[PDB]
Amino acid sequence: MPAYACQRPTPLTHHNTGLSEALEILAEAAGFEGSEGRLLTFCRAASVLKALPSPVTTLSQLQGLPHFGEHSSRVVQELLEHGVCEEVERVRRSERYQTMKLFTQIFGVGVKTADRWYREGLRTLDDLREQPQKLTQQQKAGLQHHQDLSTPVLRSDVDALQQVVEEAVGQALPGATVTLTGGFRRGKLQGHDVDFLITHPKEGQEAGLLPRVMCRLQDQGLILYHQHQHSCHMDAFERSFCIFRLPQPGSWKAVRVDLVVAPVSQFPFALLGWTGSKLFQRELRRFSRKEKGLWLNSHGLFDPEQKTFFQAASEEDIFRHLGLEYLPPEQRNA
DNA sequence: CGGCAATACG
DNA sequence: CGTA
DNA sequence: GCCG
Ligand SMILES: O=c1ccn([C@H]2C[C@H](O)[C@@H](COP(=O)(O)NP(=O)(O)OP(=O)(O)O)O2)c(=O)[nH]1
Ligand SMILES: [Cl-]
Ligand SMILES: [Cl-]
Ligand SMILES: [Cl-]
Ligand SMILES: [Cl-]
Ligand SMILES: [Mg+2]
Ligand SMILES: [Mg+2]
Ligand SMILES: [Mg+2]
Ligand code: NA
C-alpha cells in the first residue's frame, strides 16, 4: 500500500465503511479543536482503509499499513472486538462536538468562528438568529437557507441545475462550455452543492464572464445569494459562490452552486483541483512537492529549478508530469 | 523537530 | 475572518 | 497523529 493517497485508487464505496467512518469522526473532532496535524493523520488512515481490497477483520492486517500507529490501530482494534470505540462514542455524544458540527456546517462559518461562538455560550441556530447584527451577509444567507442546505443534493438536482447553468452560460458567451466537477464528477450520488467549471476554446474570451452569467440567472429569479470573486499565466480564476432557487413540484429548494471560470490553457489544472477529493488534492500536492520537487496548485504546476510552468492539455498530462499512474475521478475518492 | 496543500480574493 |  |  503506497504512502500517498494519490498513488492508489480509492473508490467511492468500499469494504471498510464502518472503520473509516469512525476514524473520520476523530478527524473531524481534531479539526474542531484546532489540531490540524491530528486531523490529517486520521483522514489519511481512514483513506487507507477505503483503498483496501477487502474488509479488515483482524488487528494483524494493519501491520505495515501507512498512517496506522498506536492511536488509529487501537480504534480499529476496539471496533473489531466490541463493535464500538469508546473514544468515538464519547466524541459523538459530546456537547462540544455536536455544537461545533452544527455551527461549522453553516455556510460562512469556519472552525474559528464556531469555536468563538461556542466559548461565548451559544449553542443553537436560534441563538445565532437572535444576534443578527453580528452575522456577515454570507452567514445570514447560510442561516436563512440552512434547512435546505442541509438537505442532500441529488443527481436529479444536478441535472436540472446543469441545464440552467448551461443555458445561462451559453447566453452570456457563445461557445463557452460547462463541465460538472466536484464530488458528482467523482461519482457521488449526493452532495452538499454542485460545482461547475466554465471555459471557452479561444483563450481570453472567457474573461469577464461571470457578471454576465449572474445577470442572466438573476433575470430568471434563480439567484438567492451570491459572492463573486474577480480573476487576477493566471494565478486566480473568476469564481461565484451562489445559492440557487431550484424549482421542485409545487415549491422550490435552495441549493449551493459554485461556478469557476478558467482560461482553456489552465483548464486541466482547474479541473484536477476542483474534482477533488479534498484529501486527494492535499495528497497530490504533497507528493508533487516532496517527492518530485514540483509545486502544484489549481492554476498550474511549477518547476522551481527551471522556473517554468508545465503546459497541460489534459488531466492525463498532469499525472504523467508527476510520474503517477492515471486515476479517473471515480478513483479519487480519498 | 519539522512537516503537514493550496491561495488570491473580498 | 471565510470561500473552492 | 504519524513520519523520517
Ligand atoms: O479545502 C478544500 C476544499 C475544496 N477543494 C477542492 C476539492 C473539492 O472536491 C472541490 C469542491 O469543493 P466542495 O466543497 O464543493 N467539495 P465536493 O464537491 O468534493 O463535495 P461536496 O460539495 O458534496 O461536499 O474543491 C480543495 O481542494 N480544498
Ligand atoms: Cl495537531
Ligand atoms: Cl455518495
Ligand atoms: Cl479556483
Ligand atoms: Cl482534462
Ligand atoms: Mg461540491
Ligand atoms: Mg463547492
Ligand atoms: Mg510536534
Ligand atoms: Na461552514
Side-chain angles (χ1 to χ4, degrees), chain A residues 1-62 64-69 71-73 75-76 78-89 91-129 132 135-162 164-166 168-201 203-304 306 308-310 312-334:
Chain A
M1 160 97 42
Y4 291 83
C6 58
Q7 287 174 305
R8 63 201 183 228
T10 317
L12 180 61
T13 60
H14 56 91
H15 313 291
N16 288 283
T17 308
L19 299 175
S20 59
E21 286 178 346
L23 292 170
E24 282 181 344
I25 296 285
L26 296 180
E28 184 183 19
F32 295 159
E33 302 315 299
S35 304
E36 289 291 323
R38 288 173 169 71
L39 173 152
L40 183 54
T41 283
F42 285 130
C43 282
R44 290 173 176 160
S47 82
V48 161
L49 297 186
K50 302 175 193 180
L52 287 170
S54 64
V56 173
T57 58
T58 190
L59 187 62
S60 72
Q61 288 159 345
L62 296 183
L65 294 185
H67 307 299
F68 274 88
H71 198 138
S72 294
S73 299
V75 174
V76 172
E78 294 188 7
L79 291 163
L80 296 175
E81 179 176 349
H82 302 105
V84 288
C85 167
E86 196 37 58
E87 180 183 7
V88 174
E89 293 306 303
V91 168
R92 278 197 228 272
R93 307 188 301 262
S94 79
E95 178 179 18
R96 166 76 180 184
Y97 173 83
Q98 296 177 355
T99 307
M100 290 294 289
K101 188 167 182 56
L102 178 67
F103 286 168
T104 59
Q105 281 174 168
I106 306 164
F107 180 54
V109 178
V111 170
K112 291 186 160 133
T113 296
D115 175 68
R116 178 168 58 75
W117 286 346
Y118 190 87
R119 291 188 277 108
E120 282 167 8
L122 302 166
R123 292 296 187 269
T124 71
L125 299 186
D126 280 344
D127 291 345
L128 311 171
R129 296 191 172 110
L135 305 172
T136 63
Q137 297 304 118
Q138 195 163 83
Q139 285 161 358
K140 288 181 207 277
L143 278 170
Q144 173 69 32
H145 295 296
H146 181 268
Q147 171 179 343
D148 284 350
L149 296 193
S150 90
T151 300
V153 184
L154 305 184
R155 281 288 337 186
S156 57
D157 301 325
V158 172
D159 294 342
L161 287 160
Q162 182 150 5
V164 160
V165 171
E166 286 175 351
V169 169
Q171 288 175 336
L173 176 64
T177 63
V178 174
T179 298
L180 176 65
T181 183
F184 287 105
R185 182 171 182 245
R186 303 196 306 277
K188 287 187 77 182
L189 297 187
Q190 69 172 53
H192 295 111
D193 74 1
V194 193
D195 309 280
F196 293 109
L197 171 59
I198 300 160
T199 192
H200 189 282
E203 183 103 358
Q205 291 309 103
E206 81 294 337
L209 182 54
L210 288 185
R212 287 169 58 80
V213 172
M214 296 309 310
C215 173
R216 274 140 188 94
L217 292 166
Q218 290 172 317
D219 288 351
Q220 304 178 296
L222 302 183
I223 303 300
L224 295 158
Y225 169 87
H226 84 288
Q227 174 172 68
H228 175 247
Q229 301 182 330
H230 289 83
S231 79
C232 55
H233 178 78
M234 301 178 56
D235 62 10
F237 300 140
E238 188 182 26
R239 282 122 56 98
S240 287
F241 314 127
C242 308
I243 298 171
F244 280 42
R245 176 170 167 155
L246 180 68
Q248 304 280 268
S251 187
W252 60 267
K253 71 165 173 188
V255 182
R256 278 276 293 109
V257 177
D258 288 327
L259 308 177
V260 51
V261 183
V264 63
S265 68
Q266 300 178 240
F267 173 93
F269 293 104
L271 182 62
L272 181 59
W274 276 74
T275 295
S277 67
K278 171 181 171 181
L279 178 66
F280 191 89
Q281 297 301 308
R282 301 171 77 150
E283 291 281 288
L284 184 68
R285 296 166 180 181
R286 186 169 64 100
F287 175 87
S288 186
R289 176 175 287 268
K290 305 300 183 176
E291 302 303 327
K292 301 298 179 176
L294 304 174
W295 305 343
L296 181 64
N297 61 25
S298 286
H299 307 86
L301 179 62
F302 186 74
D303 181 343
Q306 186 172 91
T308 53
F309 289 92
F310 290 76
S314 64
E315 293 180 315
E316 289 192 56
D317 266 346
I318 301 169
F319 281 84
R320 283 186 296 257
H321 294 321
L322 293 177
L324 290 164
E325 294 181 300
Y326 179 73
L327 293 172
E330 293 85 356
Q331 300 297 330
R332 303 183 201 159
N333 284 290

